[PDB]
Amino acid sequence: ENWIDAAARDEVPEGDVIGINIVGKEIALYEVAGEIYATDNTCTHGAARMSDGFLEGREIECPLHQGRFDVCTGKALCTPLTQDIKTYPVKIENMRVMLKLD
């Protein structure tokens, strides 16, 4: 229901993040303690691409001004940020990463 095969599970590296372009949306995939999660690959604060980089635990650090989001809830943690980032449901199925894009 807007569910889409988006990547192989093992394309997302332990503890790190990757960027994908898919159906015209740029998306970040994250590996956090055995689970996969997803957000927009664009920082809400500026023209910054979250896939590069720095994921520490469940916190992703913007490469620009070091704003940080909780990857599981999309909530903004520290300044400069003011706006939460959009999250997308994922399920892992037969080694595939599925996304609910709206």
Asked if 77 touches ligand FES (CB under 6 A), the answer is no
In this structure, are residues 10 and 95 in contact, taking their beta carbons and an 8 Å threshold? yes
Strands 90-93 and 96-100: antiparallel
Residue 71 engages ligand FES in binding (rule: CB under 6 A): no
CA-atom Rg of the chain in angstroms: 13
Cβ atoms of 67 and 42 within 8 Å: the answer is no
Question: Which of 6, 18, 55, 62 touches ligand FES by CB under 6 A?
Answer: 62
Question: Please, what is the minimum distance in Å from the beta carbon of residue 79 to ligand FES?
Answer: 8
* Segment contacting ligand FES by CB under 6 A, of 1-9, 14-22, 31-39, 59-67: 59-67
**At 76, which helix (H) or strand (E)?**
strand 76-78
The answer to whether residue 45 forms part of the interface with ligand FES (CB under 6 A) is yes
Residue 43 is assigned to a ligand binding site? no
Q: Which of 80, 91, 92, 96 binds ligand FES (CB under 6 A)?
A: 80
Residue type, 56: E
Residue 67 among known ligand-binding residues? yes
Output the six-digit token pair for 9. 């599970």
Q: Which of residues 13-42 bind ligand FES (CB under 6 A)?
A: none
